[PDB]
Amino acid sequence: ATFEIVNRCSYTVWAAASKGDAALDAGGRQLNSGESWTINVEPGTKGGKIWARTDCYFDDSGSGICKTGDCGGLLRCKRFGRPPTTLAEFSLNQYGKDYIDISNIKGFNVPMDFSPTTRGCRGVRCAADIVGQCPAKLKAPGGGCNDACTVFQTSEYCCTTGKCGPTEYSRFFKRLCPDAFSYVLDKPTTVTCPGSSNYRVTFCPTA
């Protein structure tokens, strides 16, 4: 399948694409403002993620640091990144359908549109100034708006017992992006698409 990753923000990002224990495609790439990067994701891949990283440095050998979303110091992510990261999430071809979501469960760093480029299903978006508004205790230094489970480390915010409610903090994310997951047991805003669809991720879509 095809992922076209478009940076419509006015600042450079370092896109990432991982499933958790391996890169997707090249696993990451600088995208200056306006630049695009199309990747190939192997059919059926379950649980993949695409995110932006901000304020990075990488050396010649690709190793470095980013202030949001860092995946173990690699330009080319083979693992997931450090919150706060807005997440595009997907599992493809799982019995005749792909399922797409955007998640604020690890926080938010960059607004995002995640729309199918082939018919049948509707995209999802979170474009609101979450970082401009973000509650003080959830602010990150380094940039972005952390989730409560990162900042506090409780069973209720992390949903560790499998029983958790919405919180004042989950609801701050759901007031501003009702189509994105705001905590682990949120009512699903998943989208079911035909198997083997293609997609576009766009950062700073309003921009």
Swiss-Prot record:
Record Pfam families: Thaumatin (PF00314)
Keywords annotated in UniProt: Cytoplasmic vesicle, Disulfide bond, Signal, Taste-modifying protein
Annotated Gene3D superfamilies: Thaumatin
PROSITE patterns xrefs: THAUMATIN_1, THAUMATIN_2
Subcellular localization(s) per the UniProt record: Cytoplasmic vesicle
Keyword Iron-sulfur: no
Alphabetical list of SUPFAM superfamilies matching this protein: Osmotin, thaumatin-like protein
GO cellular component, one term: cytoplasmic vesicle
Disulfide cysteine pairs (residue numbers): C9-C204, C56-C66, C71-C77, C121-C193, C126-C177, C134-C145, C149-C158, C159-C164
Chief localisation class: cytoplasm
PANTHER family: OS03G0233200 PROTEIN
Family according to the record: Belongs to the thaumatin family.
Function: Taste-modifying protein; intensely sweet-tasting. It is 100000 times sweeter than sucrose on a molar basis.
Protein name per UniProt: Thaumatin I
Organism: Thaumatococcus daniellii
